[PDB]
Design a protein around this nucleic acid. Structure first.
Ligand SMILES: [Cl-]
Ligand SMILES: [Mg+2]
Ligand SMILES: [Mg+2]
Ligand code: NA
Length: 329
DNA sequence: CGGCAT
DNA sequence: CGTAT
DNA sequence: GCCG
């Protein structure tokens, strides 16, 4: 074989694709590589899984992997075992291991990453109750993650997104007339659920957005909508989202950008995570330009590319434009 | 050999 | 260290 | 783990 460019930003990856079983197995090995501190192996297994999401048809024979980028001896063997036996011994051993299950449990807590989870694992901790019994080990961020863990493990749905966008738009409009709110993240790519909702806030007049996020947060807090906030241009918070007769905690990310940076922030925050890593790698390695959510920098001329749209950025990098629903790498 | 996004 | 895509 |  199939046409397959090496970088994920060079090919469409739709929301619904084939090979979900094969990719999920490779993504288990990627996650486990991360849990052992091997970011390089994590990346290769993520990239191999993503290649399968971009293929036109189901892989039913090992020969369909010939020539595909990021498939070497290890990733090919995993696919071969799945095709020949329906199961891969290495994947099952990882999946069922105490180490994997505990690291997955701990790293899913808001405020806990691999290094913290591994430290706790090495100390003999295994359950969330173990963590509650030792609150001296916890940051304020981790305390919020643990206190709201049940709700934060409940997938966020589109009905929640629409309600949250309304309350964010109300607070933003009270804080700065003319400011806008754009849904980003996985929901913009067409996903039907997420672990959070991501919003990007700007104003059409450059500079007017300075100081906006503290004003938005104060207004949300005054409506009783904020359970946790980090206290700036990014706010990783937990909202008290009204439900009929009650409420549920929901993770919400709010990001402010000046309008000059909006296309870059929209591109970055729409993802996917792998798509953006691959896009930034492509930009630096293939074009010599440095990309992030603030701009696209030419380090030789020492200038920033002025963009008005995501399309402008793709074109400047020599890439065919992909709409958000084709960025699900 | 080392890079692997910022 | 954690967070984000 | 794969590749530039
Ligand atoms: Cl989905
Ligand atoms: Mg998200
Ligand atoms: Mg988010
Ligand atoms: Na976490």
């Amino acid at each position: 074989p199939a046409w397959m460019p090496a970088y994920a930003c060079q090919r469409p990856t739709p929301l619904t694709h084939h090979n979900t079983g094969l990719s999920e197995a490779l993504e288990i090995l990627a996650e486990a590589a991360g849990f052992e501190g091997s970011e390089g192996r994590l990346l290769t297994f993520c990239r191999a899984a993503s290649v399968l999401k971009a293929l036109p048809s189901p892989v039913t024979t090992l020969s369909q992997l010939q020539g595909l980028p990021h498939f070497g001896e290890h990733s090919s063997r995993v696919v071969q075992e799945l095709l020949e036996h329906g199961v891969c011994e290495e994947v099952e051993r990882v999946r069922r291991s105490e180490r994997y299950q505990t690291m997955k449990l701990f790293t899913q807590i808001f405020g806990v990453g691999v290094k913290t989870a591994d430290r706790w694992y090495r100390e003999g901790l295994r359950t969330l109750d173990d963590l509650r019994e030792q609150p001296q080990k916890l940051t304020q961020q981790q305390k919020a993650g643990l206190q709201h863990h049940q709700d934060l493990s409940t997938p966020v749905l589109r009905s929640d997104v629409d309600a949250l966008q309304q309350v964010v738009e109300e607070a933003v409009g009270q804080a700065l007339p003319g400011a806008t709110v754009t849904l980003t993240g996985g929901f913009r790519r067409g996903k039907l659920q997420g672990h959070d909702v991501d919003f990007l806030i700007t104003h059409p007049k450059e500079g007017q957005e300075a100081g906006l996020l503290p004003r938005v947060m104060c207004r949300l807090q005054d409506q009783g909508l904020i359970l946790y906030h980090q206290h700036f241009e990014r706010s990783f918070c937990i909202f008290r989202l009204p439900q009929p007769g009650s409420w549920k905690a929901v993770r919400v990310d709010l990001v402010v950008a000046p309008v000059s940076q909006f296309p870059f922030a929209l591109l970055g925050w729409t993802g996917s995570k792998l798509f953006q890593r691959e896009l930034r790698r492509f930009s630096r390695k293939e074009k010599g330009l440095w990309l992030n959510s603030h701009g696209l920098f030419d380090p030789e001329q020492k200038t920033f590319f002025q963009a008005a749209s995501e399309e402008d950025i793709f074109r400047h990098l020599g890439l065919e434009y992909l709409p958000p629903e084709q960025r699900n790498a």
